[PDB]
Amino acid sequence: FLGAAGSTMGAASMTLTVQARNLLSGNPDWLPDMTVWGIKQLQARVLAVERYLRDQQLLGIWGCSGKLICCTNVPWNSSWSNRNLSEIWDNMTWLQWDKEISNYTQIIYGLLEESQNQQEKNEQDLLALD
Amino acid sequence: FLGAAGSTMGAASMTLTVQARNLLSGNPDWLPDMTVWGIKQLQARVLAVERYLRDQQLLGIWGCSGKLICCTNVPWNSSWSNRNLSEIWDNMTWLQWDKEISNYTQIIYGLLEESQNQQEKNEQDLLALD
Amino acid sequence: FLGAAGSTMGAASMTLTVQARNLLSGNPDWLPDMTVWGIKQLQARVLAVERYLRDQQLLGIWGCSGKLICCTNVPWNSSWSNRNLSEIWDNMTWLQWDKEISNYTQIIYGLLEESQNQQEKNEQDLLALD
Amino acid sequence: NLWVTVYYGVPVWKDAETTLFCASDAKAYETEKHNVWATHACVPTDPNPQEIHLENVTEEFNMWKNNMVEQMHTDIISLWDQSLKPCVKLTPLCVTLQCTNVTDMRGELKNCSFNMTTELRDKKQKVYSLFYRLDVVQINNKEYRLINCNTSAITQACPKVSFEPIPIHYCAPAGFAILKCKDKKFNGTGPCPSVSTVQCTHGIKPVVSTQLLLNGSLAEEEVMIRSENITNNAKNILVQFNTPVQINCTRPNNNTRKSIRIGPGQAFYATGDIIGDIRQAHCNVSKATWNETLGKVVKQLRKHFGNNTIIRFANSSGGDLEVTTHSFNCGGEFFYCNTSGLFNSTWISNTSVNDSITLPCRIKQIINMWQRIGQAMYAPPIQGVIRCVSNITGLILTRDGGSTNSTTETFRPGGGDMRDNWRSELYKYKVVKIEPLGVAPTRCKRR
Amino acid sequence: NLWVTVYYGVPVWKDAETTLFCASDAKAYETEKHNVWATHACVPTDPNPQEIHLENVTEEFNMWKNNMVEQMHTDIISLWDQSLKPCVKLTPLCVTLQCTNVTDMRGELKNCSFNMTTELRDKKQKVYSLFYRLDVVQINNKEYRLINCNTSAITQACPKVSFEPIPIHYCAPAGFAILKCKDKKFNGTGPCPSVSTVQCTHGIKPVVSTQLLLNGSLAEEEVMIRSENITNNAKNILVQFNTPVQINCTRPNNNTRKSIRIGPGQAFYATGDIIGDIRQAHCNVSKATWNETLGKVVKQLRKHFGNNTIIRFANSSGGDLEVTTHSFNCGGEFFYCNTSGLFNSTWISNTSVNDSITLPCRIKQIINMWQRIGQAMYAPPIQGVIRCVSNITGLILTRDGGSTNSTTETFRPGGGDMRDNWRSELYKYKVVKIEPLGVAPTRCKRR
Ligand SMILES: *[C@@H]1O[C@H](CO)[C@@H](O[C@@H]2O[C@H](CO)[C@@H](O[C@@H]3O[C@H](CO[C@H]4O[C@H](CO[C@H]5O[C@H](CO)[C@@H](O)[C@H](O)[C@@H]5O)[C@@H](O)[C@H](O[C@H]5O[C@H](CO)[C@@H](O)[C@H](O)[C@@H]5O)[C@@H]4O)[C@@H](O)[C@H](O[C@H]4O[C@H](CO)[C@@H](O)[C@H](O)[C@@H]4O[C@H]4O[C@H](CO)[C@@H](O)[C@H](O)[C@@H]4O)[C@@H]3O)[C@H](O)[C@H]2NC(C)=O)[C@H](O)[C@H]1NC(C)=O
Ligand SMILES: *[C@@H]1O[C@H](CO)[C@@H](O[C@@H]2O[C@H](CO)[C@@H](O[C@@H]3O[C@H](CO[C@H]4O[C@H](CO[C@H]5O[C@H](CO)[C@@H](O)[C@H](O)[C@@H]5O)[C@@H](O)[C@H](O[C@H]5O[C@H](CO)[C@@H](O)[C@H](O)[C@@H]5O)[C@@H]4O)[C@@H](O)[C@H](O[C@H]4O[C@H](CO)[C@@H](O)[C@H](O)[C@@H]4O[C@H]4O[C@H](CO)[C@@H](O)[C@H](O)[C@@H]4O)[C@@H]3O)[C@H](O)[C@H]2NC(C)=O)[C@H](O)[C@H]1NC(C)=O
Ligand SMILES: *[C@@H]1O[C@H](CO)[C@@H](O[C@@H]2O[C@H](CO)[C@@H](O[C@@H]3O[C@H](CO)[C@@H](O)[C@H](O[C@H]4O[C@H](CO)[C@@H](O)[C@H](O)[C@@H]4O[C@H]4O[C@H](CO)[C@@H](O)[C@H](O)[C@@H]4O)[C@@H]3O)[C@H](O)[C@H]2NC(C)=O)[C@H](O)[C@H]1NC(C)=O
Ligand SMILES: *[C@@H]1O[C@H](CO)[C@@H](O[C@@H]2O[C@H](CO)[C@@H](O[C@@H]3O[C@H](CO)[C@@H](O)[C@H](O[C@H]4O[C@H](CO)[C@@H](O)[C@H](O)[C@@H]4O[C@H]4O[C@H](CO)[C@@H](O)[C@H](O)[C@@H]4O)[C@@H]3O)[C@H](O)[C@H]2NC(C)=O)[C@H](O)[C@H]1NC(C)=O
Ligand SMILES: *[C@@H]1O[C@H](CO)[C@@H](O[C@@H]2O[C@H](CO)[C@@H](O[C@@H]3O[C@H](CO[C@H]4O[C@H](CO)[C@@H](O)[C@H](O)[C@@H]4O)[C@@H](O)[C@H](O[C@H]4O[C@H](CO)[C@@H](O)[C@H](O)[C@@H]4O)[C@@H]3O)[C@H](O)[C@H]2NC(C)=O)[C@H](O)[C@H]1NC(C)=O
Ligand SMILES: *[C@@H]1O[C@H](CO)[C@@H](O[C@@H]2O[C@H](CO)[C@@H](O[C@@H]3O[C@H](CO[C@H]4O[C@H](CO)[C@@H](O)[C@H](O)[C@@H]4O)[C@@H](O)[C@H](O[C@H]4O[C@H](CO)[C@@H](O)[C@H](O)[C@@H]4O)[C@@H]3O)[C@H](O)[C@H]2NC(C)=O)[C@H](O)[C@H]1NC(C)=O
Ligand SMILES: *[C@@H]1O[C@H](CO)[C@@H](O[C@@H]2O[C@H](CO)[C@@H](O[C@@H]3O[C@H](CO)[C@@H](O)[C@H](O)[C@@H]3O)[C@H](O)[C@H]2NC(C)=O)[C@H](O)[C@H]1NC(C)=O
Ligand SMILES: *[C@@H]1O[C@H](CO)[C@@H](O[C@@H]2O[C@H](CO)[C@@H](O[C@@H]3O[C@H](CO)[C@@H](O)[C@H](O)[C@@H]3O)[C@H](O)[C@H]2NC(C)=O)[C@H](O)[C@H]1NC(C)=O
Ligand SMILES: *[C@@H]1O[C@H](CO)[C@@H](O[C@@H]2O[C@H](CO)[C@@H](O)[C@H](O)[C@H]2NC(C)=O)[C@H](O)[C@H]1NC(C)=O
Ligand SMILES: *[C@@H]1O[C@H](CO)[C@@H](O[C@@H]2O[C@H](CO)[C@@H](O)[C@H](O)[C@H]2NC(C)=O)[C@H](O)[C@H]1NC(C)=O
Ligand SMILES: *[C@@H]1O[C@H](CO)[C@@H](O[C@@H]2O[C@H](CO)[C@@H](O)[C@H](O)[C@H]2NC(C)=O)[C@H](O)[C@H]1NC(C)=O
Ligand SMILES: *[C@@H]1O[C@H](CO)[C@@H](O)[C@H](O)[C@H]1NC(C)=O
Ligand SMILES: *[C@@H]1O[C@H](CO)[C@@H](O)[C@H](O)[C@H]1NC(C)=O
Ligand SMILES: *[C@@H]1O[C@H](CO)[C@@H](O)[C@H](O)[C@H]1NC(C)=O
C-alpha cells in the first residue's frame, strides 16, 4: 500500500497490483442511515463512484480496454522529458516523474484517444475487411 | 457534439468520439444537498448511472468487450434493409437509418448475444483446447 | 433462470447467458421517493451496485477482461478436487461442486491475479518490446 | 493437464438477508383517494411476473426463521407512523368530559360536554361530543376524560387516506432472488420437493387482524396446520383454511360528521348523533359453514394428538382487549368482536354433539396497537352505515399448559404478535443472495 | 524509440478535501442506552485497521490548515442539533419564578414556586422546583425567570441518551487516504520524516472541554508545545502532556428526579430536594502530580522564550463563563470549575518558590455553547451522586500582549474555539486524494 512511493519507479512496478485493489473498492458496508449523518455517509461514497467511472472512460477510450498495464502506438516525443532509460526507472521516482510531465500531460492524453482509438479502430475496420 | 446528425452516416463516423465523451460522464459536481431539492439533484443522476450500466451490458455480452466500434460474425440479412453500400453511408443519415431498421432491431440483438458470444466463446473454448 | 441448478454442470453451461442477463441489471424503474420508504427503496439498489462492481474488479484484474467465460494459464492442481473429467461435468452439479472446492477457493484466487495478470502482463511487456 | 477457468453466472446461491421493497400492481395508484395505505411512490408490479420452476432441486425451508416477516412487520409499523405524521394532532383534547347515559344495553355510549379552544385564543368553546365507553375513563355529575391521556399523547388519522389493504408484492433487488414453495401440503418446515423462483412475491394484502386471518391465501386440498414448536404449549399454532369463511361485520349506527373548527386552518371530525337502528356492532358467521370447517380441522389435529381424543373449544382466557377479542378495521372503524359464541363447542372423535349466528362487537376509535406508547391514533367518524364482507382464511391458536396430557386437550384463540399473520403468507418464501462467480478446470489455457 | 504506456495505480497523490465518515468500533453499539452520543448507524471499525509505513518518504504537515478539524467541529455541532430535535421542548417554562434562599455559601440555590400547565388545558398547576443561580435571573418577595428566555428558546435533553464520549475513527472513502505522522516529537508544522497511512484514524473521544484537554492522547518522551503563531500573543498555544493528570470532578449533592407530568404524553424531569452532604461541586488535583508536570512544561517554554526568564502563571483574565472557567460534562451534568487555585504560582529558571488540592465548581443545566442563539439545552437531573475520573492530557493557553517583551512573560488559560481541541488529536493527520492514472515510455508498442 503505497510502500514504493519513496522507492524508484522500477521498484514501484512490482506492488502496482496492491494499489489497484485497495483503491478500487471501498464498502464498509453499512446499510443503516438517518436523515442527517446518513446523507454524510452517502455524499462521500457517491463521489467515490463518480470519480471512478471518470477514470474508467479513459481506460476504455484509449488503447487499453483492460486494467493494470497496457501499451499503445504513440511514439515518445523527445521534447517530452528527454532522458535516459536508466535515469527514469532506476534513478527516479513517480512523484518526481509526474512533476516534470505536468506540462505535456494534456498533450499525451490527446494522442491516446484521438491518434489511436479513433484512428486505430477505424484502421482496424479497414484492415479487418480484407 | 451531434453536429453530424444532419450529415450523412459516412461523415458521422468522424466525430463519433465526441458523442461518446460528453454522453458518458456528467458530474457538475456538487456535494451540497438538502431534504427537498437535494433529492431532485439525486434522482436525475442516479437514473443516469442506471441507464448507463444498462447499455454497458450489451457491449460486454456482445462481440465487443470494448468501446467505440467493434465487429462481429453475424452476416447481414438481405431482408434487413436491402440496400446499396453507397446508399447507406454516402446518401443516407442515421436518424433516417434507424427509422427503417426499427422492425429488425430486436432480431439483430439476438444474433449478437446468442449466435455469437454464447456460441462463439464456447467455440473458442473448443478451439483453445488444442 | 437457474433451471439447470439441479441439472449437471455440463448441462448448466448452455443457459449460462440467462443468469448473466437477469442478475446483471435490475431497474424497476421508479423515480418517486419519500423521506421514509424512499430510503428503503434506495438502500437496496445501492447495495446492488456496490456488490456488482466488487465482482467486476475480479473479472478485470484476472485473465478475463471480458464477461461470460474466459480462460487462464493457471494449471489445475491435483490436490484441488482430484477427479475424473466426466465425473465433474457429466456426473456432478455446481452446488455439489462448490461444496468441495470451498477450502481451495481462496488459493485459486491468488493464482489468477498474482500468478497471471501481475506476472503475465509484465511478461507481455517484455514480449511486446521485441 | 487441465487449467482453471472463470465461469460467470453459475447457478450458486447462499441464504442471506437484504432490504426488500414493495409492489402495488400499478393499479392501486389509480385507486387514488390520497395515498391509500402504502401505495404512494410504490413500485408498480411487472405485468408479467416471472416464475421459473427449478427441476431436480430440493431446498429446506423454515417459515419461523424467515426474515421477510420481520421486515414486513417493521414495514407496517414504519408505514403507520408516516401516515400519522402529517395529520392533525389531538393534544388539547384532554379537557374534562361531563358525560351522561345515552337513551338499553347498559348505556354503552356517553354524551359528553366539554370546553374547547377556538380559532381565536381568547374565548373558549362549549361543545359536546359522543365517545364510546372504551375511549373514555372517569376521574374522581359524571365526569370523564380521554383514556389515553394518562398513558400518552394522541393524534387523529386524516379522513383523506384510507386503511384499505391493497395487494403488495415483495421483490428483491439485483443480486438477490425469492424462492417459492409450490407444494400443496407444506407446514413451513422440512424439505421442499418442487421449488420455483420469482422476482416478485404474489399479491399480499396487509390485513391486520387478531384471532382471525382475514383476506388471506387459501390452502390446497387438506387444510394446513403450522406451529413453531407443537408439543410446546407456549407457541402459537397457525392454521390455513381450504374454503373461505363468509364473515359480516357492520356498523349498525348511521352517523354524521361534525367537522368542528379548531383553527386556524385545522378542522376536527367529531362523532354526531346516531340516526337509525339503535344497536351494538355485530359480526355474523353462518352456522353451517363454520361447523363444516371445524369438522375438517379437528381431524387434522388428530394426525398429531392421536387418532382418538377429546378436543374441546373455549373462548379467550384473559388479557388485553387485543388478545381477548377479534381486532380489525372495516370502513375506517376498528371493531373488537366477541368470539365466545363460536368457540363454545365439544367434539367427539369425528363429530360434535339453525340458519345464522351473530357476534357482539365493540368499537374503539383511540387505539394503541403493537404496544405503542407515546402515540395514540384516533379513528375518524364515518358518514352512514359501514358494511363489509371478508374471507376468514386462518386462525391464531394456543394450547393450554394444564396436563393431564394423556387425557384431553383444549385450544383457545391466540393473539399478540402480528408477525404470525405475515408468516401465514410468507411461509413458502425465503431470501437468498446469488453468487455468480465460479471456477472450473479446462484444457483451453491461453496463448 | 520508446512508446507511451498507461500505468494504472501508480503511487501519486495530491492534497485535497472530502467528506469523512465515522467509525464506532462496533462495540459502542452494544453499549446501547439508546444511541449514546454519535453511534446509532455509525460505521463499525475494521477489527484490523491497516497502517502501512512508507519508506524513503518525507511529507510536510500543517495541523492548523487541517480540514479534518473543520469537518469534525461541524460534525459535533450538527450531531448536537439532531439529538435535541426529537426530545421534549421546554418552551412554556418562562413562567414567573417566586424564589427564596436555600438553608451557608451565600444561598447559591433558589427554591422557586411557579404556575404550570397540566395535561388538561383548563386548570393550571402550582408547583415548585430547584434551580441554580446561573439558570435564573430576577426581574424588577424575590421573583425570578429563566435566564435564556430573553435571549432564546429552550429544549430539554432526553434522559435516555447519554453525552458519554465514545471513540470515533475518521475514515476516508474510496479514492482517498489518511496520512499519519509517527514521529515522537512533532509540533504540527514542518517536514515529517516517517509517514504511515491508515484507512481509519485512531480512537478519538470527542470530549468537549475548556482550559483542559480531557481523555486525549499522550505525547511521546518530552511534552509537546504547539502554536499557530508563537511570537503572536493573539494565537492560542496548544500543549500535549506526557503523563496523564488525575482529576476528580464530583457532584456532592445526592438528588432525586421529580418526573412531573406536562402531558398528554410528555414528562419533564425536575430537580428535587438534595439529600446528603451540603456542599458545592468541587474538582480535585493532586499537588505533587500537577507540580511535577509544571516543572517539565515550564522548561519547554524556555526552548523558545530563552534559557533564563521569569514565567508567572495566573487565572483567567475575564470574559464569558465558558472562557473564564473549565467547562465540561460529567455524568450528564455540566460543571464549570474555578481553576484560579492551580494557576497561582511563580517559577524561577528551573524551580518554583501538602497532600491534596480542590477547585470550586459551578453547575449550569441550561447552556448555550458554541455561541448558539435560538436553541438552549436543559441538562436533565441525575439520581444519586455523580463521580468521574478523567485524564488531563493538555491545555489551551494564551500569552499577554503587554510588553516589556525582554523582561518577563505571563500565561493564562485560553478558551473559545473548540477546533483547537480537535487539532490536538488531528495534528498528525491530513486528507489527500489519490491519483492512480499515469503514463510511462516503453518499447512494447502494440501489434
Ligand atoms: C420444543 O418443544 C419440545 C416440547 O414441546 C421441547 O422438548 C423438551 O426438550 C427438553 C430438552 O431440553 C426435554 O427435557 C429433557 O428431558 C430429557 C429426557 O428426560 C426424560 O427421560 C429420562 C430418562 O428416560 C429413560 O429412562 C427411564 C428409566 O430407565 C425409562 O423408564 C424411560 O422409558 C427412558 O428409557 C427421565 O429421567 C426424565 O424424567 C425426569 O424428567 C421429567 C421432565 O422434567 C420429569 O417429569 C420426571 O419426573 C423426571 O424428573 C424424562 O422422562 C432429560 O434427560 C433432560 O435433562 C437434561 O437437561 C436438564 C435441564 O432441563 C438438566 O438439568 C439435566 O441434568 C439433563 O442434562 C444432562 O444431559 C445432558 C445431555 O446429555 C448433559 O449435557 C448434561 O451435562 C446432563 O448430564 C431434559 O430434562 C423435555 O422433556 C422436552 N419436553 C417434553 C414435554 O418432553 C423442546 O426442547 C423444544 N425445542 C425447541 C427448539 O423449541
Ligand atoms: C506571525 O506572528 C509574527 C509575530 O508574532 C508576525 O511577525 C510580524 O511580521 C510583520 C510583517 O508583516 C512585522 O512588521 C514588519 O516589520 C518590518 C521590519 O521592521 C523592523 O526592522 C526595521 C528595519 O530594521 C533594520 O534597520 C535598522 C536601522 O539600520 C537597524 O537598526 C536594525 O537592526 C535592522 O537592521 C525597522 O524600521 C522597524 O522598526 C519600526 O517598526 C517597528 C514595528 O512597528 C516599530 O516598533 C519601530 O518603532 C519602528 O517604527 C522594525 O524594527 C517592517 O519593515 C515592515 O514594514 C512594512 O509593512 C508595514 C505594514 O505593517 C508598512 O506600513 C511599511 O511601509 C513596510 O512596507 C514596506 O516594505 C514592504 C516589503 O518590502 C514593501 O512591499 C512596501 O511597499 C514598503 O516599502 C513591517 O512593519 C512585525 O514586526 C512582526 N512582529 C514582530 C513582533 O516583530 C507575523 O506577521 C505573523 N505571521 C502570520 C502568518 O501569522
Ligand atoms: C353476510 O352477508 C352476505 C350478503 O348479504 C350473505 O350472503 C348472501 O346470502 C343471501 C342469503 O343466504 C343470498 O341471497 C340469495 O341470493 C340468491 C342468488 O345467489 C338470490 O336468488 C336470492 O333472492 C331470492 O330470495 C330473496 C329472499 O327470499 C328474494 O327477495 C329475491 O327476490 C329472490 O327471489 C326470487 O327467486 C325466486 C326463485 O328462487 C323466484 O320464485 C322469485 O320470483 C324471485 O325471482 C337471495 O337473495 C346472497 O346471494 C348472498 N350473497 C353472496 C355475495 O353470497 C351472507 O349469508 C351473510 N352471512 C351471514 C353469516 O349472515
Ligand atoms: C481522585 O480519586 C481517585 C480515586 O479515589 C484517587 O486515586 C486513589 O488514591 C488513593 C489514595 O491516594 C488510592 O488508595 C490506595 O490504594 C492502594 C492500592 O493502590 C490501597 O492499597 C490503599 O488501601 C490501604 O489504605 C486505605 C486507607 O489508608 C485502607 O482503608 C485500606 O484498607 C488499605 O490498607 C491496607 O493495606 C495495608 C498495607 O499497605 C495493610 O497494613 C492493611 O491491613 C490493609 O490491608 C489505598 O486505598 C487509590 O488506589 C487511588 N485509585 C486509583 C484508581 O489510582 C486520586 O488520588 C484522587 N485525586 C485527587 C486529586 O483527590
Ligand atoms: C377484505 O376484503 C374485502 C373485499 O375486498 C374488503 O371489503 C372492501 O371494503 C371496502 C371498504 O373498506 C370497499 O370499498 C368500497 O367500495 C364500494 C364500491 O366501489 C365501487 O362502486 C362505486 C359505485 O358505487 C364506484 O364509483 C367505485 O369506483 C367502485 O367501482 C364503495 O361504494 C364504498 O364506498 C362506501 O363505503 C365506504 C366504507 O365501506 C365509505 O367510506 C364510503 O364513503 C362509501 O359510503 C367503498 O369505497 C370494497 O369495495 C370492499 N371490497 C369489495 C370487493 O367490495 C374488506 O374491507 C377487507 N378487509 C379488511 C380488514 O380490509
Ligand atoms: C473521561 O474518561 C473517563 C473514563 O473513561 C470517563 O469516566 C466514565 O464516566 C462514565 C459516566 O459518565 C462511566 O459510566 C459508568 O459506568 C459504571 C460502570 O459500569 C460497569 O459496571 C456495571 C456494574 O456496576 C455494569 O453493569 C456495566 O455493564 C459496566 O460494566 C456505571 O456504574 C455508571 O452508572 C452510574 O453512574 C452514572 C453517572 O456516572 C449514572 O447515570 C448511572 O445511573 C449510575 O449511577 C456509569 O454507567 C464510565 O464507567 C467511566 N469510565 C470508566 C473507565 O469507569 C469520563 O466521563 C470521561 N470524561 C468525559 C468528559 O466524558
Ligand atoms: C354441520 O355439519 C353437518 C355435516 O357434517 C351438517 O349436516 C347436514 O345436515 C343437512 C340437513 O340439515 C343434510 O342435508 C340432508 O341431506 C340428505 C341427503 O340429501 C337428505 O335426505 C335430508 O333431507 C337433508 O336434506 C346434510 O347432508 C348434512 N351434511 C352432510 C355432510 O351429510 C349440518 O347441517 C351442519 N350444521 C348445521 C348448522 O346444520
Ligand atoms: C514538586 O516537585 C518536587 C520535585 O521537583 C517534589 O519534591 C519531592 O519531595 C519529596 C519529599 O516530599 C522527595 O522525596 C524525598 O526523597 C529523598 C530521596 O529518597 C529522601 O531522602 C527524602 O526523605 C524524601 O523521601 C522527592 O525526591 C522530591 N522530588 C524529587 C524529584 O527529588 C515535590 O514533592 C513536589 N510538590 C509537592 C506537592 O511536594
Ligand atoms: C362475550 O360472550 C360471553 C358469552 O355469551 C359473555 O359471557 C356472559 O357474561 C355475563 C357477564 O358479563 C354473564 O352474565 C353471562 O351469563 C355470560 N354468558 C354466558 C353464555 O355464560 C360475555 O359477557 C361477552 N362479552 C364480554 C366482554 O365478556
Ligand atoms: C421548597 O419550597 C417548597 C414550598 O414551595 C417546600 O415544599 C413544602 O415543604 C413543607 C415542609 O416543610 C411542606 O409542609 C409543604 O406542604 C410543602 N409544600 C409544597 C407545595 O410542596 C419544599 O420543602 C422546599 N424545598 C425543600 C424540599 O426543602
Ligand atoms: C475563584 O478563585 C479565586 C481565588 O480564590 C476567588 O477570588 C476571590 O474573590 C473574592 C471575591 O469574590 C475575594 O474576596 C477573595 O479574596 C478572592 N480570593 C483570593 C485568594 O484572592 C474567586 O472568587 C473564585 N471564583 C470566582 C467566580 O471568581
Ligand atoms: C514533438 O513535439 C514537438 C513540439 O511539441 C513537435 O514539433 C513535434 O512534431 C513532435 N514530434 C512527434 C513525433 O510527435
Ligand atoms: C349509566 O350507566 C352506567 C353503566 O355503564 C351505570 O354504571 C350508571 O350508574 C348509569 N348512570 C345513571 C345516572 O343511571
Ligand atoms: C439570599 O441570598 C442572596 C445572595 O445571593 C442575597 O443577595 C439575598 O439578600 C438573600 N435574601 C434574603 C431574604 O436574605
PDB file of N, CA and C and ligand atoms in Angstrom, chain D residues 315 338 340 362, ligand 9:
ATOM      1  N   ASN D 315     -63.489 -19.882  24.562  1.00  0.00           N
ATOM      2  CA  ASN D 315     -63.090 -18.523  24.216  1.00  0.00           C
ATOM      3  C   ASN D 315     -61.810 -18.099  24.934  1.00  0.00           C
ATOM      4  N   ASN D 338     -66.730 -10.182  19.972  1.00  0.00           N
ATOM      5  CA  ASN D 338     -66.797 -11.241  20.968  1.00  0.00           C
ATOM      6  C   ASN D 338     -66.972 -12.603  20.313  1.00  0.00           C
ATOM      7  N   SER D 340     -66.757 -15.515  21.726  1.00  0.00           N
ATOM      8  CA  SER D 340     -67.121 -16.525  22.716  1.00  0.00           C
ATOM      9  C   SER D 340     -68.211 -17.487  22.248  1.00  0.00           C
ATOM     10  N   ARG D 362     -67.336  -4.534  19.799  1.00  0.00           N
ATOM     11  CA  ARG D 362     -67.126  -3.246  20.450  1.00  0.00           C
ATOM     12  C   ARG D 362     -66.289  -2.330  19.562  1.00  0.00           C
TER      13      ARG D 362
HETATM   14  C1  LIG F   9     -68.861 -12.449  25.307  1.00  0.00           C
HETATM   15  O1  LIG F   9     -69.723 -13.598  25.264  1.00  0.00           O
HETATM   16  C2  LIG F   9     -69.849 -14.295  26.513  1.00  0.00           C
HETATM   17  C3  LIG F   9     -70.741 -15.488  26.260  1.00  0.00           C
HETATM   18  O2  LIG F   9     -72.077 -15.089  25.985  1.00  0.00           O
HETATM   19  C4  LIG F   9     -70.400 -13.363  27.593  1.00  0.00           C
HETATM   20  O3  LIG F   9     -70.434 -14.065  28.829  1.00  0.00           O
HETATM   21  C5  LIG F   9     -71.533 -13.585  29.632  1.00  0.00           C
HETATM   22  O4  LIG F   9     -71.034 -12.771  30.698  1.00  0.00           O
HETATM   23  C6  LIG F   9     -72.073 -12.192  31.502  1.00  0.00           C
HETATM   24  C7  LIG F   9     -71.397 -11.265  32.485  1.00  0.00           C
HETATM   25  O5  LIG F   9     -70.755 -10.184  31.824  1.00  0.00           O
HETATM   26  C8  LIG F   9     -72.873 -13.303  32.174  1.00  0.00           C
HETATM   27  O6  LIG F   9     -73.938 -12.724  32.921  1.00  0.00           O
HETATM   28  C9  LIG F   9     -73.432 -14.255  31.125  1.00  0.00           C
HETATM   29  O7  LIG F   9     -74.066 -15.361  31.758  1.00  0.00           O
HETATM   30  C10 LIG F   9     -72.320 -14.762  30.209  1.00  0.00           C
HETATM   31  N1  LIG F   9     -72.872 -15.585  29.146  1.00  0.00           N
HETATM   32  C11 LIG F   9     -72.790 -16.919  29.133  1.00  0.00           C
HETATM   33  C12 LIG F   9     -73.420 -17.604  27.958  1.00  0.00           C
HETATM   34  O8  LIG F   9     -72.234 -17.544  30.028  1.00  0.00           O
HETATM   35  C13 LIG F   9     -69.527 -12.117  27.702  1.00  0.00           C
HETATM   36  O9  LIG F   9     -70.070 -11.176  28.621  1.00  0.00           O
HETATM   37  C14 LIG F   9     -69.391 -11.453  26.334  1.00  0.00           C
HETATM   38  N2  LIG F   9     -68.596 -10.227  26.387  1.00  0.00           N
HETATM   39  C15 LIG F   9     -67.595  -9.934  27.239  1.00  0.00           C
HETATM   40  C16 LIG F   9     -66.960  -8.589  27.045  1.00  0.00           C
HETATM   41  O10 LIG F   9     -67.216 -10.702  28.118  1.00  0.00           O
END
